[PDB]
Subunit: 80 residues, 4 copies
Amino acid sequence: NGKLKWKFETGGSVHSSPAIGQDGTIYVGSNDHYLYAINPNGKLKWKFETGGSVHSSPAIGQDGTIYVGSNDHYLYAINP
Amino acid sequence: NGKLKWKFETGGSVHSSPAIGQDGTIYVGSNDHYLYAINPNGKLKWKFETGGSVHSSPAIGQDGTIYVGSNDHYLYAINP
Amino acid sequence: NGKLKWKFETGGSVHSSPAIGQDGTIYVGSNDHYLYAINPNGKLKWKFETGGSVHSSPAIGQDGTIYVGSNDHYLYAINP
Amino acid sequence: NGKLKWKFETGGSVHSSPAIGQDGTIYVGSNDHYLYAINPNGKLKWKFETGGSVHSSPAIGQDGTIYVGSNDHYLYAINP
Ligand SMILES: [Zn+2]
Ligand SMILES: [Zn+2]
Ligand SMILES: [Zn+2]
Ligand SMILES: [Zn+2]
Ligand SMILES: [Zn+2]
Ligand SMILES: [Zn+2]
Ligand SMILES: [Zn+2]
Ligand SMILES: [Zn+2]
Ligand SMILES: [Zn+2]
């Protein structure tokens, strides 16, 4: 209907575009160098430190592996 | 066929990439800080103020929740 | 296998990310202000002038309508 | 669970967003001008030189053709 139902504060501008995994866990990268995993309800599931801003938007494989690039030249494959 | 069928003026450059929800409602974020929801025919459905330019591109969950990040460091989950 | 099978010269850097329509027609926006439609084989189908660089990546609706934003503040809905 | 399972060093910041092909091969473009293809396990499959940074995110056609744009004004269609 357009009403907010939660925001989640990362550390920097979230330029990455978010992905939704087979279980509704939402994955997004932030300029704070972190890929965030938020449970569908708004509470963090985990965050993964890389070496630079995550402008890449996460891709999601069949087994649920999360694939995302980072300003630190690396393509990361992260277990769920 | 390539003919236009409507443009919709947001307030700033629309860098966000648009998403299409289970009902055809198209969701896009604009540098005017707004996530826009446009009914499939071109008339606004609603727009949601965040605190900065929305470069993130909206993700869309099973229940239709719209997930998008914003230059204001937050990941937003917005009801339809 | 990794061999090229065609490039298509737009007028400026293609930052937009390409979309594939129900018939294989590939849609991408270019900084030359144009959304390009390329037939699956590499020959243009059409290109649609907007008022600025198309950094947005095209979305594709059920009927095949192409939805994309542009640096000119507008969200465009373009017939196939 | 959030544990890493491999990073892959490209040559520059990976701004492109990665795509997953019908066989799990992950495709991403890097600012080093290369579109990378990584086998699902982390070892390269191949990398394709273009003429500029690949900010575009790869699209994937029915036959597995990889479609991506590049800062060198070209839209590339690359065999698997
Ligand atoms: Zn900030
Ligand atoms: Zn940094
Ligand atoms: Zn402007
Ligand atoms: Zn602002
Ligand atoms: Zn150039
Ligand atoms: Zn211009
Ligand atoms: Zn971008
Ligand atoms: Zn660097
Ligand atoms: Zn270069």
